[PDB]
Amino acid sequence: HMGVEEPVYDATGKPLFGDPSEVHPQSTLKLPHDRGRGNIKTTLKNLPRKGDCRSGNHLGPVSGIYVKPGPVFYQDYMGPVYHRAPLEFFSEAQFCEVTKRIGRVTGSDGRLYHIYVCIDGCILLKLARTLKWIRNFTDCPLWVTSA
Ligand SMILES: [Zn+2]
């Protein structure tokens, strides 16, 4: 009843609605992977790195990088998440003075995008033209990376 195109997925990897789709082979998200011991927020500077799921960190368990508009970052998350960027809620972005690249995500079009955080707070995508995440419609984050 959200009436959206792109599904969100539970912590077992099952879509809450619609058909499942696979992640891009070169995305930083590697599935299958466990998640959901807690909802643990973090910051851009301290995003978890590859390998961190083994030991976790001082904030608690780590499953990977999650992001939603705000921007808000998590190192683990329990609720439904996007496995692909929901391009229905993105639009063309204008120039960004300073960016931080945080991963590589599959788009809802099946294509591979670099994902960034702009200094203005916007979440940006670039293929391999820039798009920005303008609508936090479902308030579900995008699972960017498996740690
Ligand atoms: Zn892992």
Author numbering: 17 to 144, 150 to 168
Please give me the paper's original passages concerning this structure:
Here, we report the crystal structures of CSFV Npro and a C168A cleavage site Npro mutant to 1.6 Å resolution. The C168A protein was expressed as Npro-Δ17N protein that contains a Cys168 to Ala mutation along with an additional four residues at the C-terminus, 169Ser-Asp-Asp-Gly172, a sequence that corresponds to the first four amino acids of the core protein. This construct was intended to trap a substrate-bound form of Npro; by mutating the cleavage-site residue, Npro should not be able to catalyze self-cleavage at its C-terminus. Unexpectedly, the C168A mutant was active and the SDDG peptide at the C-terminus was cleaved, as confirmed by mass spectrometry (data not shown). Introduction of the Cys168 to Ala mutation resulted in different packing in the crystal lattice. The C168A Npro crystals belong to the spacegroup P212121 with one molecule per asymmetric unit and a solvent content of 54%. In comparison, CSFV Npro structures do not have a disulfide bond between Cys69 and Cys168 because the active site-containing helix is disordered in the wild-type Npro and Cys168 is replaced in the C168A Npro. Since C168A is as active as the wild-type Npro in our hands, disulfide bond formation is not a required step in catalysis. Thus, although Npro does not require Cys at the cleavage site, Cys168 is conserved in pestiviruses, suggesting that the residue may have an additional function other than participating in the protease catalysis.
Pestiviruses, such as bovine viral diarrhea virus (BVDV) and classical swine fever virus (CSFV) use a virally encoded protein, the N-terminal protease (Npro), to suppress the transcriptional activation of the IFN-α/β genes by interacting with IRF3 and inducing its ubiquitination and proteasome-dependent degradation. The Npro protein is a leader cysteine autoprotease that cleaves itself from the nascent polyprotein during translation of the viral mRNA, freeing itself for innate immune suppression activities. Npro has a unique ‘clam shell’-like protease fold that is distinct from other known proteins including all known proteases. As predicted, Npro consists of two domains, a cysteine protease domain and a zinc-binding domain.
